[PDB]
Write a sequence for this structure.
């Protein structure tokens, strides 16, 4: 359940109405890691299995710990990978509503990729959830070039990566309940508001 490739294995003749693209944390397994599967389960509960495509960011995204230290909090190659997936969703399924998310390095990756998109594709991203957002302080709790009202950051008290460092403490490992609850719910609400 930690690996989902619904978009890259999907075909333009049977598009889902909703496409979720998610970037895991450093060292995490599959392309969804610890939090992505919980978000996915809740999205499927809301929209039906056939109502949503779940896609983790794989490929050039190696999710290496060292890359957190790069200026954007991840590598340029990883950013091009996630960009490519948003573009693929846009081309393959032009009527689909997009949603996105990421944890730790994957939150930096989601923020960087979304910033760098064309507005036509970015505008289709109804909501984005970020857990343990390593650029939370630096970006003032936002994703540059993307509306605050479409952004929900989960940054626990004592999660030091949310306050400008890269020190991992216990609260950084405690996002499970958020991923099973308010995070998917935010995404579901944003999608339902756009699609009616």
């Amino acid at each position: 359940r930690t690996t989902r490739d619904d978009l890259i294995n999907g075909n333009s003749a049977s598009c889902a109405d909703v496409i979720f693209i998610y970037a895991r944390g450093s060292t995490e397994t599959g392309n969804l890691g610890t939090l992505g599967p919980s978000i996915a389960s809740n999205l499927e509960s809301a929209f039906g299995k056939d109502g949503v495509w779940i896609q983790g960011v794989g490929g050039a995204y190696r999710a290496t710990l060292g890359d957190n230290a790069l200026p954007r909090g991840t590598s340029s190659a990883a950013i091009r990978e996630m960009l490519g997936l948003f573009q693929q969703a846009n081309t393959k399924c032009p009527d689909a509503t997009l949603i996105a998310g990421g944890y730790s390095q994957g939150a930096a990756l989601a923020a960087a990729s979304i910033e760098d998109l064309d507005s036509a594709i970015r505008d289709k991203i109804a909501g984005t959830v970020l857990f343990g957002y390593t650029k939370n302080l630096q970006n003032r709790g936002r994703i540059p070039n993307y509306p605050a009202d479409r952004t929900k950051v989960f940054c626990k008290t004592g999660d030091l990566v949310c306050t400008g460092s890269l020190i991992v403490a216990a609260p950084h490992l405690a996002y499970g309940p958020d991923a099973r609850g308010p995070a998917p719910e935010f995404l579901i609400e944003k999608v339902r508001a756009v699609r009616g």
